[PDB]
Amino acid sequence: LALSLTADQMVSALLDAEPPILYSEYDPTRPFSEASMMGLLTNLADRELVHMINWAKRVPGFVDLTLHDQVHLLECAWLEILMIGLVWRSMEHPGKLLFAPNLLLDRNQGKCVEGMVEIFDMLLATSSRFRMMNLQGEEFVCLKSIILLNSGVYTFTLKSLEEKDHIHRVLDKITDTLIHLMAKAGLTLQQQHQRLAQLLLILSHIRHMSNKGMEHLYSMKCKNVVPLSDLLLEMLDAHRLH
Amino acid sequence: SLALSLTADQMVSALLDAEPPILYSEYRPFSEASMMGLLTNLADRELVHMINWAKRVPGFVDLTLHDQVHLLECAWLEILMIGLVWRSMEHPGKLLFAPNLLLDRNQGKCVEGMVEIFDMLLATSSRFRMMNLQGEEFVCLKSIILLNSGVYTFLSSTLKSLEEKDHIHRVLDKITDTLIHLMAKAGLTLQQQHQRLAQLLLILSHIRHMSNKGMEHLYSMKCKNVVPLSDLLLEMLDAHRL
Amino acid sequence: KHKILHRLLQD
Amino acid sequence: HKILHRLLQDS
Numbered sequence: 470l471a472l473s474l475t476a477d478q479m480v481s482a483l484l485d486a487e488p489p490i491l492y493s494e495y496d497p498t499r500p501f502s503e504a505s506m507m508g509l510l511t512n513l514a515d516r517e518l519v520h521m522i523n524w525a526k527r528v529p530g531f532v533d534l535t536l537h538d539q540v541h542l543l544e545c546a547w548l549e550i551l552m553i554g555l556v557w558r559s560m561e562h563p564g565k566l567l568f569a570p571n572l573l574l575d576r577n578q579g580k581c582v583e584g585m586v587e588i589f590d591m592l593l594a595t596s597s598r599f600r601m602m603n604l605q606g607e608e609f610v611c612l613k614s615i616i617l618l619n620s621g622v623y624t625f626t627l628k629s630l631e632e633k634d635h636i637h638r639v640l641d642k643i644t645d646t647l648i649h650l651m652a653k654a655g656l657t658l659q660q661q662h663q664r665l666a667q668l669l670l671i672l673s674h675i676r677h678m679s680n681k682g683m684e685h686l687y688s689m690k691c692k693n694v695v696p697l698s699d700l701l702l703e704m705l706d707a708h709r710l711h
Numbered sequence: 712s713l714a715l716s717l718t719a720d721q722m723v724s725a726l727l728d729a730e731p732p733i734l735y736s737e738y739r740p741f742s743e744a745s746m747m748g749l750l751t752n753l754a755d756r757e758l759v760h761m762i763n764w765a766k767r768v769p770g771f772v773d774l775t776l777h778d779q780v781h782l783l784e785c786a787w788l789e790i791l792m793i794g795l796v797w798r799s800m801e802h803p804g805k806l807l808f809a810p811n812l813l814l815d816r817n818q819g820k821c822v823e824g825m826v827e828i829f830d831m832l833l834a835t836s837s838r839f840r841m842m843n844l845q846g847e848e849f850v851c852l853k854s855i856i857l858l859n860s861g862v863y864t865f866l867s868s869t870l871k872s873l874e875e876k877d878h879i880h881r882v883l884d885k886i887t888d889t890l891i892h893l894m895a896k897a898g899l900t901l902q903q904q905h906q907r908l909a910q911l912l913l914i915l916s917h918i919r920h921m922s923n924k925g926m927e928h929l930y931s932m933k934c935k936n937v938v939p940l941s942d943l944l945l946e947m948l949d950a951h952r953l
Numbered sequence: 954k955h956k957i958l959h960r961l962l963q964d
Numbered sequence: 965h966k967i968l969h970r971l972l973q974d975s
């Protein structure tokens with residue numbers, strides 16, 4: 470059970486669960502267009518989703534949930550999870566986003582893509598914030614797992630309450646884990662609570678980016694810019710956008 | 712600089728004293744135009760009070776006028792919503808927009824497109840109820856929203872701007888200190904304090920999500936020309952696509 | 954609707 | 965943008 474894991478054991482589990490870094494199908498023979506750039510990014514996102522599903526199954530407590538509830542959490546959180554991973558990989562690349570090792574973009578490179586620049590700017594700002602805070606990998610994996618469990622929990626009869634309570638108990642364990650990591654790292658008691666709040670407050674901005682990014686992807690689909698894979702179409706359709 | 716020297720108790724007192732009034736709606740069967748009228752006329756009157764409240768949140772008037780505008784443009788609907796969810800806490804299944812405007816789901820919907828937002832607001836009020844959110848905690852969370860929601864989209868890299876972001880983050884840390892102090896006063900163990908802090912800040916991600924959905928709904932209602940929106944409300948709305 | 958995500962969660 | 969700016973100044 471996830472509830473009996475120690476903090477060290479929780480971190481080890483999340484760290485071993487980490488998905489691989491995937492490469493893009495970037496073709497340097499031709500210039501980008503709006504369509505080709507969107508094709509590369511959505512092809513990448515689609516391949517990542519399969520790995521994300523298999524990562525979620527390894528997050529302590531996730532497989533205790535009903536299949537309906539697992540679907541709901543992933544449907545709610547998938548873009549947030551892709552974004553936090555992107556912002557993490559981009560930390561050491563000021564001014565650029567590392568979508569893949571062979572696809573590192575600055576803000577001018579995708580300027581052909583309508584509506585991109587607001588989102589690019591927010592993602593860059595978040596990566597800069599993580600860098601400034603000196604976010605550690607152990608903290609990152611805790612935050613990513615918090616996004617999975619938290620984002621969809623509020624939009625979940627007797628059975629529902631126990632599912633909710635379970636998610637909340639696991640989230641509490643992750644809070645304990647973050648605090649333990651901070652303490653082990655030498656932070657004072659006051660710095661621990663200040664840092665915990667700073668990290669969790671960033672998750673509000675990640676939600677905001679996800680909502681904007683979902684509307685952007687919807688606009689690209691609705692304009693026939695890029696064909697989305699069946700899975701991506703389903704993840705997008707879960708958000709019931711206009 | 713006065714803000715950064717407040718004790719936890721002085722911060723709570725300041726925030727409690729800043730609180731805006733609870734406003735009324737108009738004193739038989741609702742329509743889409745009439746209900747949107749009542750809700751947007753109320754939101755507009757509240758916005759004027761919100762501006763004056765914001766000026767009383769410790770640290771806010773230390774910021775440039777440009778930065779105060781930016782924070783309120785980003786946060787205003789989140790701030791309206793957290794106030795609504797708070798007023799509705801003790802009325803399970805209802806939303807208390809005003810003391811003479813209390814809406815339930817049992818009532819036939821008179822406005823298209825708002826059931827999902829209605830249910831999310833109700834779920835938040837229920838979460839607050841389950842957590843037994845205290846008034847002193849609520850005012851902390853509302854000020855965190857004002858200061859946090861827009862700080863990530865100050866993209867300016869000039870020295871003055873960095874100092875401004877630094878200051879916002881120093882004030883946010885003070886508010887975190889205040890929340891933890893309230894929890895310590897209430898007899899929570901250190902472990903319970905950090906857990907509750909995290910539980911409350913994670914709800915702000917849900918509130919961001921609702922604001923994003925509510926902004927799209929208001930925009931659709933504007934485009935439908937169903938409701939005359941006030942000049943101020945239109946400009947607060949316009950900020951979210953500018 | 955045999956949702957893809959539902960199936961993948963079982964494989 | 966202007967109305968908010970005016971109200972924040974206004975006292």
Ligand SMILES: C[C@]12CC[C@@H]3c4ccc(O)cc4CC[C@H]3[C@@H]1CC[C@@]2(O)/C=C/c1ccccc1C(F)(F)F
Nearest residue numbers: 510513514551552555579582585588589682685686
């Ligand atoms: C949804 C979208 C395309 C996929 C993006 C993505 C792909 C793979 C990852 O590991 C993470 C991500 C996070 C952001 C996703 C993007 C948000 C909006 C989007 O439709 C495209 C945005 C876009 C297009 C062109 C150039 C840059 C961007 C950027 F920066 F905004 F993401």
Ligand SMILES: C[C@]12CC[C@@H]3c4ccc(O)cc4CC[C@H]3[C@@H]1CC[C@@]2(O)/C=C/c1ccccc1C(F)(F)F
Nearest residue numbers: 750751753754791792795822825828829925928929
């Ligand atoms: C923007 C909108 C109308 C104003 C609402 C409001 C008014 C006064 C407050 O103190 C708080 C709020 C928060 C919710 C705001 C609303 C979100 C979408 C909206 O366009 C209208 C929604 C709506 C219309 C009719 C019946 C219910 C709702 C609800 F519940 F979703 F908000």
